[PDB]
Ligand binder design. Sequence first.
Ligand SMILES: [K+]
Ligand SMILES: [K+]
Ligand SMILES: [K+]
Ligand SMILES: [K+]
Lengths: 465, 465, 465, 465
Amino acid sequence: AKRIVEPFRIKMVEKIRVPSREEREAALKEAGYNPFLLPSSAVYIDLLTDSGTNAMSDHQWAAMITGDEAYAGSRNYYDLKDKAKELFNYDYIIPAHQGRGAENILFPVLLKYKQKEGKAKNPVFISNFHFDTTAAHVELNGCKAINIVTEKAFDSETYDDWKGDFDIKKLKENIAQHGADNIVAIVSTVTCNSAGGQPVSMSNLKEVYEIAKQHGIFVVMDSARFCENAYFIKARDPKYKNATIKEVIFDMYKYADALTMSAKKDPLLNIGGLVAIRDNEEIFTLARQRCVPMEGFVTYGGLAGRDMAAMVQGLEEGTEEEYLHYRIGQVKYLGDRLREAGIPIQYPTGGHAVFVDCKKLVPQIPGDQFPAQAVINALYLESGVRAVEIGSFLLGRDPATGEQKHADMEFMRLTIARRVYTNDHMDYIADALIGLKEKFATLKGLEFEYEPPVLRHFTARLKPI
Amino acid sequence: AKRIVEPFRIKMVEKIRVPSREEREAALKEAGYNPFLLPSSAVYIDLLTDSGTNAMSDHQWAAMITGDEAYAGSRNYYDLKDKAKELFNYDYIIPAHQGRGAENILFPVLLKYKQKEGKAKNPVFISNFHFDTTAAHVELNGCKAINIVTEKAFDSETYDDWKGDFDIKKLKENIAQHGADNIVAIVSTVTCNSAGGQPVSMSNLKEVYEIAKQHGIFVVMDSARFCENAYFIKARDPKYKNATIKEVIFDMYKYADALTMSAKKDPLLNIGGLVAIRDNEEIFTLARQRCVPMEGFVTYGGLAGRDMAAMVQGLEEGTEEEYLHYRIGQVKYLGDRLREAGIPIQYPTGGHAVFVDCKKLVPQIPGDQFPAQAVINALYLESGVRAVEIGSFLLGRDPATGEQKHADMEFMRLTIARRVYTNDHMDYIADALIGLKEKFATLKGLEFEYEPPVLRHFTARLKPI
Amino acid sequence: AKRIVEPFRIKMVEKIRVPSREEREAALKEAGYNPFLLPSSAVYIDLLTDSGTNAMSDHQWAAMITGDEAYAGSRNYYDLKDKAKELFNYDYIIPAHQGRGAENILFPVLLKYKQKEGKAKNPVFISNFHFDTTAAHVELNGCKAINIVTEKAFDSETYDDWKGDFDIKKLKENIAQHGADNIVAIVSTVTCNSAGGQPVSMSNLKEVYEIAKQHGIFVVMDSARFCENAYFIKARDPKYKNATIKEVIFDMYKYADALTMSAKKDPLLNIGGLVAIRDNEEIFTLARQRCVPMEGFVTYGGLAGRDMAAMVQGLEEGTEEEYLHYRIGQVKYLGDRLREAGIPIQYPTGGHAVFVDCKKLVPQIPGDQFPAQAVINALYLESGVRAVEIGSFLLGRDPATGEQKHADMEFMRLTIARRVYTNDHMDYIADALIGLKEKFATLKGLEFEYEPPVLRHFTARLKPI
Amino acid sequence: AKRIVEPFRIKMVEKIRVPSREEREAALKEAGYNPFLLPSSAVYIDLLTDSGTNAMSDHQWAAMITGDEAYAGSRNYYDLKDKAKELFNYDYIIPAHQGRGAENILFPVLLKYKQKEGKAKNPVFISNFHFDTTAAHVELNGCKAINIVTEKAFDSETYDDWKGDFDIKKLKENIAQHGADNIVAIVSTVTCNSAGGQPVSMSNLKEVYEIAKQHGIFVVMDSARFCENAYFIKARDPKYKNATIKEVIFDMYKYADALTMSAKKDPLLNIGGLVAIRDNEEIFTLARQRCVPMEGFVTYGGLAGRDMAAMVQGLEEGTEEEYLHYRIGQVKYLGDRLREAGIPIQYPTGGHAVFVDCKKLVPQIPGDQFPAQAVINALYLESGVRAVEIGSFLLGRDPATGEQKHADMEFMRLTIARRVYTNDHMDYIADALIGLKEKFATLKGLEFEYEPPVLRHFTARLKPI
Ligand SMILES: [K+]
Ligand SMILES: [K+]
Ligand SMILES: [K+]
Ligand SMILES: [K+]
């Protein structure tokens, strides 16, 4: 396992504490054995997500201080528009308060646009893998969300360079089965979050786009982690070996017609989103009409002018290679410490998180007793570290039978915020999990106390068996 | 006119400039004669709105610096929940990125809840006056928005203590006409924005609520300007003469079942919103489910933890009587300067803006040629001041005929941001408007250089006749 | 009296409060009838000084966030060096923590340098008027401080364009009487602080410098209020009518060999000082050797890197003409309000304060009972405003007699911080003083409760007679 | 070597870069082969000092935003006064812009006070080891500075718990030789900076004070690193094994009459100093009289109000045992990596820095050709790390001989700022120096290209022999 040194130094700290074992026990109980309900004051290292918890630089804070709060025509709106043109070569932007706000603005518009023509009678969206909010917006607008990530993604321990790739065969099959008239859009998720933050190669992006253009399908690049994706392209694709990260990004965006982006990820913010449209003025116009009632006036889109200013600077900092090398090498370091100790993970590690296969750690716990959640709860009780479940607890029940939907993998996600934790915090997390090796055998499994009909993952209360 | 001194001093300034008249001319020329498309660098004093342009205190900025960005369970979410309980006595809160995000969360849920029971077959919402985003969410959810503000509001020059009051007779008629089963909710807007920022009295709020409860109708308090409303109750209602602002606020919230709030207004923020629900756990639960896909996870609701922290401090600062007395006395000063010089305004002045009747100043320009906007542009070319048109340009066309709807008022809104401008900036606005008197007579009227089917006012290109 | 509008708007406020009469009585008593000993919490509007209490801009605070804290070689040290070259054309700088720190570095060095040659046997310093700290350093180094300001300065009510000028006849007499060999340096104070913030004309600066260079005397420009001085030159000297403020500044510094500067005045800071030397490398080298033990390493001089960064931005903002016009116009507005009510002031008003000639207000109080201090205390008690005495209280005892040294003028200085208070705060101050008109005759006078041997103006405890 | 994990996480970063070798070479050349004249932009990791380069917390930054800039009676002045009472039990404070400002205020006053009695005819100061500025102020006031640190301090590789201790026998001998009447003060430096940041034991501090009080000698505690000293007492003295850090601190200050403090060290600030006097009101009054001309008015002492506010919070954070354990453990980590690799260091490591012996690394370079500076320079050329030479280049020339003074040691000081660098930056430094091992043998030595008289080390330009 190799530690990579920060290409920055610390300028401001925030105190963190390890609550006592007694305090953690009381807190977990109070939270109904569901870490999502814990107050942040009961957490030492928080690995719930890499969304909006990042540390900004002094230049981002400085940009906030001088941000223009004007209701219309903020200076920072124009700077953001120029930044999006510089990075992606896209001519239109609509700021949004966060990624799911950008989805909310654009997706209904793309459906309406396909329907206007008389098409989209049985509308679907196709993606390598739809993130949870993205799929939620697809479904709320009456469409079907289809995921066709390569099957190499489901082979956890086997190394592959590009586990976020679309399965091209399945794409062609879906187009023939549903008809191009029913495909509202293809959503290319970079990096492919739900497959473990695995990169999509340039040639796969290009082939997907070429096919889409042969059938007139609109392509949207879900870009929360577009920089981590570009780093991996540069690291693993010989063709981009000597290219700068911005060159890679520039080529990637040749293969989409628009982007939706959570700026809470790669652009190193605490809040913020964006819609950028390459050149379709009609889509831009319609998306602006929806922006007004849902997010805000079109030159701020539900953000303070200081957050647009921070976004402009964060977009530049998120592309820097020295930073990306360190950031992703840190996630790899954590992954390697775990792997070297016999803990099974998705390998290789993606850009922002390490996924631990809990099935192999607790064979005695059946899917429906949430084995990944039992590991997470033990980790919490043992170290004050908060991780999140990507398994059968999250998957939920089959609506037709009302039975626990079958979960192929029982993952614990160790999600890492950008520029917040050092490699010694990474060692603390790895030692806590390795240390549970002889406790895994005795873990019991959990039951429901209160099971909500929807979004159970977030508020269900549980109890050990 | 009486000037009231600031109960604070200046700690940080932001530079503003009066572009040269040719710059102004060039700018307005280039903006297609429509100030909602000017960049903020073309503006000297901005009076477009009082939303999100406020100046925060040093305690608000300090609260931002230590705000908790945790994804779940932020410390500032708990502080906000306690502050809402303290101010309104409401037990449930859902943060939102801004007021229209709170409307988007709650309104669909209220409709579904009324329909769940089998009711709401021809659904309507009734308000003293629906703000523009509020009415847009009502209509987007297939409902009708009915406004029943007292007719005293339309008598501009005649003083009345309570021009934002609901007409109780029209309320009872609407209930009988539509049926209580069709009334999804009553929306009490305080202050009554669309009537000129005019207060709703405590006895009117109470009567509306009592009637609503007889019929089982849910009442929502649209609270962007609740503190300005409470100041006016304390100033004009003998019953609250010796009460504190917080006591007034506490009594007001006994007359609603929930509130929607743009925290960009009275709570003195640049971004931020809130949904608070008094005690209906089921509505809370359903609103939480909608919050997730639209705004964000339920403990941050599309806000950075630093903005929840500023919001807690801002809610406290917004209730301070000395500040409210100053703030509202500044708007009354600008109004009195105008009134004393013979410019007709809605009187008395509301909490946050001065409304000027432009029909009376440019009689030769008919509604369809935009009298208010020609006043607005003139005001921009002469002084760099950007005001907003509340008239024929804003009213729009009637889709049935494509007929320019008839406005009964051609207003110029002079909207004032909190703690940003001095009484001297107020004298600059008034003198510039009083300096136009000779030119009003020679004012032309504008034509459309480019007109859009929706967002007219935001994006239409116009040209002088 | 004419109110001039701010060329900026407010971005951050600081709450201020009027303590009750009961609190003000208690506080003044506790501070032994000496406002210098009051806590800031017992003060409403603070007019004690215009030093370090200014309001910075958003660009100044932004500059502080990215400031380089490096011990040696800070980026901001090089920016400050380039800024001093740009403004003054001086090639060497030494930062200092504030203006008396710059005096402490430079004055000892100039003495030593004059003595090295065998001169300076009975060393003196000559100025138009030595500020208090400046004279203190002159005396601490065993030298005599001589002040030769024009006699027009002592004629309060009679207008003169240049009351800070040096009396050229007295200069030539002093050179002849002491000998050029005994004159360590001439100190040109701009504006002339002790004369009421009155400007020194360009032709007087030039004449003084030409004379100094005939006798080989070193000239130091005490520059705390160099921008206020430059504004007055542009406003009153026909030769600079069309010049920019920077052109005026560039010409003024042609008439000195070095400068000492409190950056807490015109450069708009809360802390900060500077030594700049035109071209004498030897003086620079000696001043750098003294800087090390007294202030800090030579590339920070007792300042954080964030304060050097703010100083670079402040230096530029302090020169803006629209800001100086407003600022100086605010001080003239307060002075004109007083003059129009028959309150005798130094006229015309200087750049940063209004001086109220208290000998005329309180004739019944003789110097040694401190007339100006009697006015200040009554003003404090009546309004919460804190001002400062520029009279016989400050003048202190005669070292020969041990009795009250005789005082020319008995002034009350109303010192105005930059960008902090509005013209409504000025009205407040003027109205409180004007409202004391009838009380002036009966004012009792002051005795000592405790008199410190030196610097008694800062800590003496006094009692009302 | 053991890595200790941070008891905080990162909230703001500052980018740092490793110049290229080319750049590195160019820059060092341009700088005259001397790192005290390099600009910070040519440095990757800066180990010049631990003074004022620390990272503050979010609570410190927040405290700055609400700091009171009042000229007199700032709220923060009173908070600081209470804080010094709480920590040290001292009743009087005088803020100072930094530690040498505090020395400048107090030392001349102690001299004068001893002389007032007719004593101090051949005045001396005695310390375990006077820091450089401290000795400079002693000498500038005509006194002799005597250092009597235990001889255990000069035995680099031999472990001793208390290498900063005074040699009590030499103390008694010096008192007998000079006479108590000539001893202006004893200065107890904690930790003992010049001995390598080595702690002074409680029992040594107590014994020194007891002896002083018997002779009537005033004791001053030089407190820049009082918290690091307190940590070591708790770690190594069995009597304080279960005491809190604050208890240890409280006891330490029982053994002094006053303190001088650079708050740029343990209090975690970028600027700031303090004078605190236990109970001698006369010393306090005299020190306040000198504070006025040299530093500022007595309630701010040359600091902005925001820096006093940060100091109050910094003083509390610098006492936190978890932080101190991490901080001191990080220095120990760096020392253990060097020692485990065979690099000779002062052992055990002190609180804030690692001292390396370059005499043994490059025996082929005489003292006069600068053995430590050639390690530093190559260290800089290979890694971009800047350290400070504590040896022959620092030492100078004997005043009466004028030849290169004999340097006992040829120490490279690796000084570590608080909360700025991670343990991976520590590895980067350890690796850079370890990887020089082979390469050391070929090092040449350096001569002067330009050697200034008394500003040698900061200024001399040098070249390689
Ligand atoms: K966040
Ligand atoms: K805003
Ligand atoms: K200050
Ligand atoms: K510093």
